[PDB]
Amino acid sequence: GSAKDVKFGADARALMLQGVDLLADAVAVTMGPKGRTVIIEQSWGSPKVTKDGVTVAKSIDLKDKYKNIGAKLVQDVANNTNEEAGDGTTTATVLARSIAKEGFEKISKGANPVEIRRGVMLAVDAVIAELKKQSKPVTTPEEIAQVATISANGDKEIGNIISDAMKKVGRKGVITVKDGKTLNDELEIIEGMKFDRGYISPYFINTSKGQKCEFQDAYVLLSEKKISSIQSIVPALEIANAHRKPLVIIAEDVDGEALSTLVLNRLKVGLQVVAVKAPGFGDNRKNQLKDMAIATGGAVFGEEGLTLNLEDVQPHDLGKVGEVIVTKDDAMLLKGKGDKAQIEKRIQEIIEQLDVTTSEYEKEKLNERLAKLSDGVAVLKVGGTSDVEVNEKKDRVTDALNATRAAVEEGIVLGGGCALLRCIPALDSLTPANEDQKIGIEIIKRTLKIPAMTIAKNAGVEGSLIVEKIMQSSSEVGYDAMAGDFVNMVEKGIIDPTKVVRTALLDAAGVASLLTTAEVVVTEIPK
Amino acid sequence: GSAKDVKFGADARALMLQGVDLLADAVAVTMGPKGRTVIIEQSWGSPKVTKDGVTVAKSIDLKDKYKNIGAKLVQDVANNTNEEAGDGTTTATVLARSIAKEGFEKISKGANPVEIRRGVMLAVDAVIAELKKQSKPVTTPEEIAQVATISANGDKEIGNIISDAMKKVGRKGVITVKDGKTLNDELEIIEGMKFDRGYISPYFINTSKGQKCEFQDAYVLLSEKKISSIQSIVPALEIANAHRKPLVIIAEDVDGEALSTLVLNRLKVGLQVVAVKAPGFGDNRKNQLKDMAIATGGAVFGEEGLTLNLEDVQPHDLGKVGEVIVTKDDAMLLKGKGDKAQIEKRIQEIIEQLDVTTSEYEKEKLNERLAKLSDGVAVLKVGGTSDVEVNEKKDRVTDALNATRAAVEEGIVLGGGCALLRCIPALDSLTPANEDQKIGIEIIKRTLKIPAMTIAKNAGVEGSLIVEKIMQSSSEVGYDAMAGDFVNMVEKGIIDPTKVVRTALLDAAGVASLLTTAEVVVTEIPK
Amino acid sequence: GSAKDVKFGADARALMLQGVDLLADAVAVTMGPKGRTVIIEQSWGSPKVTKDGVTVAKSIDLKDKYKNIGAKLVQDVANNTNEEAGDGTTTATVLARSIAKEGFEKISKGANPVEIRRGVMLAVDAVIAELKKQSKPVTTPEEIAQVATISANGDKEIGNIISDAMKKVGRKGVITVKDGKTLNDELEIIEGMKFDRGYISPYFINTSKGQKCEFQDAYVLLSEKKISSIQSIVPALEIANAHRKPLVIIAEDVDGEALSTLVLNRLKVGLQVVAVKAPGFGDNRKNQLKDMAIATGGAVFGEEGLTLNLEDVQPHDLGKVGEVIVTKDDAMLLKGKGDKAQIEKRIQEIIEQLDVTTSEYEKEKLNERLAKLSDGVAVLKVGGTSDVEVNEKKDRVTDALNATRAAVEEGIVLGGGCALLRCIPALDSLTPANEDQKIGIEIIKRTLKIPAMTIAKNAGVEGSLIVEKIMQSSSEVGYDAMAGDFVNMVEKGIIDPTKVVRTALLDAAGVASLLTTAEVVVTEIPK
Numbered sequence A, B, C: 001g002s003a004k005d006v007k008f009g010a011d012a013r014a015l016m017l018q019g020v021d022l023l024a025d026a027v028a029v030t031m032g033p034k035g036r037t038v039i040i041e042q043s044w045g046s047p048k049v050t051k052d053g054v055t056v057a058k059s060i061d062l063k064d065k066y067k068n069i070g071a072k073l074v075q076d077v078a079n080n081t082n083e084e085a086g087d088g089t090t091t092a093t094v095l096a097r098s099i100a101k102e103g104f105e106k107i108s109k110g111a112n113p114v115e116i117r118r119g120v121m122l123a124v125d126a127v128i129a130e131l132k133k134q135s136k137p138v139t140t141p142e143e144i145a146q147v148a149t150i151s152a153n154g155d156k157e158i159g160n161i162i163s164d165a166m167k168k169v170g171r172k173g174v175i176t177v178k179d180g181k182t183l184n185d186e187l188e189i190i191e192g193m194k195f196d197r198g199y200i201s202p203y204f205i206n207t208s209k210g211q212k213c214e215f216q217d218a219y220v221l222l223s224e225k226k227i228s229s230i231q232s233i234v235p236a237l238e239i240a241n242a243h244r245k246p247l248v249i250i251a252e253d254v255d256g257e258a259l260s261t262l263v264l265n266r267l268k269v270g271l272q273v274v275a276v277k278a279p280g281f282g283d284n285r286k287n288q289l290k291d292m293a294i295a296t297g298g299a300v301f302g303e304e305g306l307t308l309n310l311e312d313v314q315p316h317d318l319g320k321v322g323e324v325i326v327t328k329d330d331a332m333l334l335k336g337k338g339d340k341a342q343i344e345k346r347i348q349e350i351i352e353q354l355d356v357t358t359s360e361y362e363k364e365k366l367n368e369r370l371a372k373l374s375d376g377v378a379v380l381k382v383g384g385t386s387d388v389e390v391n392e393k394k395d396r397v398t399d400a401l402n403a404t405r406a407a408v409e410e411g412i413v414l415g416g417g418c419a420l421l422r423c424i425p426a427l428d429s430l431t432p433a434n435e436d437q438k439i440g441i442e443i444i445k446r447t448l449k450i451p452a453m454t455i456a457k458n459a460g461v462e463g464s465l466i467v468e469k470i471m472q473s474s475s476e477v478g479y480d481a482m483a484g485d486f487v488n489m490v491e492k493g494i495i496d497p498t499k500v501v502r503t504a505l506l507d508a509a510g511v512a513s514l515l516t517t518a519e520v521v522v523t524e525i526p527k
Ligand SMILES: Nc1ncnc2c1ncn2[C@@H]1O[C@H](COP(=O)(O)OP(=O)(O)OP(=O)(O)O)[C@@H](O)[C@H]1O
Pocket: A030, A031, A032, A033, A035, A051, A052, A053, A054, A086, A087, A088, A089, A090, A091, A092, A150, A151, A154, A399, A414, A415, A416, A417, A451, A455, A479, A480, A481, A482, A483, A494, A495, A496
């Protein structure tokens, strides 16, 4: 409806490339062991100091809307890489800038940018196949410590404490990061669990920093049926809220009108309540529900056997937890106030059920329930002098945790950008169908050298010479930019998760190759 | 006396470097066989298209006076290289920019830039000594053709015609360049003379294109003594007024009172007249005077023997020339209208004088006089379609002539910037006296790679990789950027004059190392 | 000196292409039999209506200096085509625009525009050779009338009167164009003379419309020797001052003081005088001076035989002419007041001298002198109702005369742009040395279709379809754009001079391929 400005061809592509180049130039200074930090002014308080690429990317918006379009596209690259992998956002940003620049350079009258994008996608699929060929699984805790050390900008203490938390809890166990009042980082093992169901409505977020709902010493209400009716929730609301404590409502399916009343009580008067869907798709749902009620000290409502209704609720039928953390994709409970003897009885019942199962699939669920109820969770308190140092270290510790989980689930490859450098001969064996696919393959081939060049450039040396010497060396030799010398990467611990590398490459390639197909750009005229 | 703006330290150096970088970025696009051209708008008509570095440097002035200071200093580098060598101005410009940038980067509180300049000078002296050690004298006309071909941006026709002109006339003979009316270039051999005395007053310049006085079918007046009195020039100026041919007055020392009269008659009514000092010191001066008089048909006035006064001049005692060209440092006569028999008698007299002398010093003067009478003068007429193409081609022809004469004088070294690349181990063997001299030596060492990197960069390849592969290769192997491959440069003809390389390096180094000593910049406030 | 603005690469090239495109779009509307006219506002009086391409080109200057540079370069193309051939300036303009656009489109990082220019020159040489093979000489006066009709925008009356003037006077004879007081054009045969020597000083121009010096009923002074002394010109100038007829001074060589006095008298008080160099080299010069002194009724001064000095001049020793027209390169006398018996005696003497010559070179000079004395001068009086119509028609008549003389000199080819279309297979049989020469050859190959496409576009039809059907037809078939149908071009008389076509192509190609080598543009900042 509003008036629009329309730009065509080379001028529009140059303006979007200027926006892409500005955002990527800001992001790229943080890459590698010799990367620097970015200070972002916050509107409410102290400025934020970060080395995290997606944090820098999300904080940059440009007044020129043509440049802002390219900035938003590179921001999409960084955000998608952060959501899918939790690391490698700087790598994804510089790869996206490289693909966008080399694709913009190749636009001519006879060129077909859609087929160039098809060649880019084919080359990226070939590189991802080569990366999966080069990947090896993580077998030792030393590799875990090395991955967490590299991902935390070379901090050996973070790698050691993450390796210790993974040894004490498990490789698939849950580890969380929260603020510490001391100067040094500390690791504690406490009671709790995490399940992979997020919140149902986005109106319960009272902490806008992490988009999560955080309550302490809250009631948790369990039910086998869907907690729906007004005569089921309103007396429950009165009993739970009116006991000077918050409320957590775990149910099967919650969609309609009662949560709108919950949102009305949250926004107008300030009801501290949260509602989460229950996990499971069968009898495992009921088993985890009973385990929840035993661990929190609460009771199952609307069950088939006892038939306890939500119309008659008593305060002794509600579980008490020391903390509840609800995010978009998962929620978790800390320090339930349930009886220890009942938890031990349920654990022994789980042991007996494991002793009488051989289906090789219910054993997995029973072992998961036993690990959820037995070994506890890991909490990392990040020390530091001030809030800015603590937040920067939180960013690095979260990066290290995400990269360590990715390395556990999908293995490791050579770090320092050498893994992408070793996939160039896989591109050399490709036969393009036409000239535009050859252009796209060559774009990806010249893009694959960019992360190692950026890492070497941030170290103050010439990146092209370093990359050439890496390619002329054997397959195990790369460049330690911190020590500034050519070493065996595996024995020096400079390794990357395979998932992070392939996620960054795919997320950069899709958006940047889509961007290079543009001929016309339409913007609103500024008012 | 006007108001001034004063800037200190890093901001002033950054603005000066911005001006230096702007001028050097404009100049550097013309370097090498794949360099491009610069179009400069002319106020009086058609724009000029040039590949010549000093023309681009002279054509750029900046409104910001802090940037304009650095622009003027780099312009001084280019102009000094053009005056001293006639070639290599683009190389001097990029070397000066490199030295200025690395010197500005290395300035700290404890740094002493004067001692850094001392270390720069010591390193440049070492590199020039290595260049003299690496030089090879020119022995074959094929080397002459190769030098003239390389200096003329690679076309073999200019190199061949310059080689033919130097075969017909001689290695030390005089060759001139002027406009041609045909499409193709052509070489002619006509009879004439050249001596190394320029004009005495700058008011005789009629052609502002080359700051030279050009007359055709002109009178030549000769005298052994100084043409001094007013009554010595009143018959001469009366004959010039009464015979309609421009007057060339060659004398010993001309100053003060009647040169001012010639200026007055040139500016008010427009008398075509020029005054040149006589060449030689002693009997050689009067011998050359008699040679000029008998070659042009004129007579020597005020001589010791005949005692012919300047008060009584007859029209048959004045020489006639088909052309006279008077530049700042030399003068030339072409097509003297003298008797052939008298010239032949003078030539046989010179031969007989040589036959009875063995002094081995004035034998050189006698051979010079015989060459001036008998060897000939080459004229290159540059063909083309328009004035812009003709001027652009004459730039390269003049560059090739200057480089060929320099190669005759001082020999040849490897082209493509490889000669400077082979002087890096000479810097590696130096022991600096202190830290600042070490800084200057490292500045020169990193500067020595700049010309080859610029040549490779203009060829569309990565200059650092090319320079690394050259340095890892044998001493005879360099990079042909025209063919894009690594070749033996002597047998492929890619060679440079030694004088051009050392002149460009010295002229860049002195000015740029003086520039890097600055802390305070004082400019006038614009009105 | 003054502050400069420097632009790099694609933006500067786009700005100069905008200037080239604007000037060529203005010029191209006048092309062909259905071209339209351009009105140019004049500062002093009525606007000028023209179909002439170089007149439109020289009248356009742009405030944007970057666009004005390309405008000046295309103006140089048009001016060089007008000077060398006198026709085909619109064709040269559109060819130059085509070459500039296609060369600007083909510039990339790896492209070498200098070698592209070399390929352009090689392709243009091949096309010019093919045009010379395709050319045929003019044999019949019907071909003369057809050429003059085509060049005068289809005006058969102009072609007929030019053919009649060439039948009465000769194909190599002299024909002049001036204003007429009637409505229709007239042809008058007078007795007069023309030689190929222009004025010595450019200060003698009185009519700024055509840069020519025109006097009526003028004195003519001749001298075998150079008119040298002030004592030689003072009797002549006192006669020309007293006896009051404009003074034509024919001399051997004039460069000095008396011409400065002539210029001073021209500028201050207004002495209507002209000075022209003497034609010929040797005894032919003396014969011509005696011939024309007798033909004008004057006398030869300073001769070897009679020895008549320039100090004693009488009014009966000077010739009288009805008109004198002195341009930059040639001069003419009309209606010399000589004795008929003396001219007849000299003509019979020339016949007697022809009867005793067999060297086949002095016979040519004697026949030329006989044709000068007895052939006659044709004068075309151009009719019209007003000055603007007369000026437009005189532009067309001058174009027709230039094209007719070019067709006499070098023959004819097919008109309508078909001659350039038939040279495409000559480019198809070319093997380029590298990729850049291939790019230049392709540029010239696509450019060769532009004139016929422009002619068809001005006719209101689709040019590409017409050019495709011409190329698919036989070699003698072209497109009559006036009749709008495909005909035999020779049979219908749609023919062009070969010299005009090759001159336009060469003049466009040299400047436009030089322009496509630009990377940096330096302009003056406007004040
Ligand atoms: N000592 C080292 N030598 C060489 N490369 C190293 C070294 N330490 C880390 N790297 C490399 O640096 C890269 C990680 O850099 P960084 O963490 O700053 O960026 P990112 O993972 O792309 O983004 P972000 O952490 O901002 O989400 C990896 O490729 C890793 O292999």
